[PDB]
Amino acid sequence: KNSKLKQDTIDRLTTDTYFTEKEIRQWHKGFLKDCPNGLLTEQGFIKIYKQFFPDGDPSKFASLVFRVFDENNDGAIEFEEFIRALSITSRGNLDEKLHWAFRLYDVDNDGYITREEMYNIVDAIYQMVGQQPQTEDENTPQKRVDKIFDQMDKNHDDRLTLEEFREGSKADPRMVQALS
Numbered sequence: 365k366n367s368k369l370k371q372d373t374i375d376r377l378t379t380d381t382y383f384t385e386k387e388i389r390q391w392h393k394g395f396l397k398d399c400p401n402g403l404l405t406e407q408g409f410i411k412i413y414k415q416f417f418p419d420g421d422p423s424k425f426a427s428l429v430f431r432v433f434d435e436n437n438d439g440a441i442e443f444e445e446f447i448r449a450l451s452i453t454s455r456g457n458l459d460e461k462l463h464w465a466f467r468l469y470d471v472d473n474d475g476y477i478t479r480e481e482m483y484n485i486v487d488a489i490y491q492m493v494g495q496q497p498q499t500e501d502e503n504t505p506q507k508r509v510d511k512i513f514d515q516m517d518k519n520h521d522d523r524l525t526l527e528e529f530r531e532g533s534k535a536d537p538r539m540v541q542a543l544s
């Protein structure tokens with residue numbers, strides 16, 4: 365019964381996250397309000413994003429986030445996955461946050477961010493806003509991303525490793541700023 369919070373789950377969570385046992389039990393109550401039976405599917409996750417961005421279509425972005433939350437790739441976000449992601453994004457140190465962002469941009473999980481993956485995240489963000497925006501010629505989404513990508517791509521091989529992305533993002537936080 366996915367609804368019941370087991371002690372074994374709490375034990376791993378207090379080891380792996382910055383939440384106390386009392387905080388985890390309180391979060392489990394709120395989690396059950398949005399997800400009474402304890403498992404959030406991708407459609408369920410898209411549905412919550414749609415409510416929050418009524419003038420856009422956040423489906424593409426929500427699906428990208430969902431796959432990073434769903435660490436075991438079983439098609440549902442369990443409470444333990446929710447708490448782990450919340451710990452990283454709301455309490456984690458800068459290296460932990462940037463690793464999470466790297467996983468979001470690395471759509472195919474091959475260990476590299478390509479320009480095309482970065483374009484795709486940006487396009488998804490624009491869709492969520494609800495705008496495929498007309499831009500001046502030098503301000504196109506591709507042009508903006510390309511200049512930031514080029515500065516992070518220190519060996520100019522058209523892909524970003526975790527280290528290129530993380531150190532580059534410390535000098536220029538815009539790619540991860542856009543995620544929030």
Ligand SMILES: CN(C)CCCN1c2ccccc2Sc2ccc(Cl)cc21
Nearest residue numbers: 409412416429446449450453454543544
């Ligand atoms: C205000 N709230 C909806 C929580 C914040 C938004 N958001 C989110 C959505 C639904 C369930 C959990 C989360 S945590 C989170 C972590 C990373 C990113 Cl990129 C987004 C989110």
Ligand SMILES: [Ca+2]
Nearest residue numbers: 434438440441
């Ligand atoms: Ca899962």
Ligand SMILES: [Ca+2]
Nearest residue numbers: 470472474476
């Ligand atoms: Ca990739």
Ligand SMILES: [Ca+2]
Nearest residue numbers: 517519521523
């Ligand atoms: Ca590179």
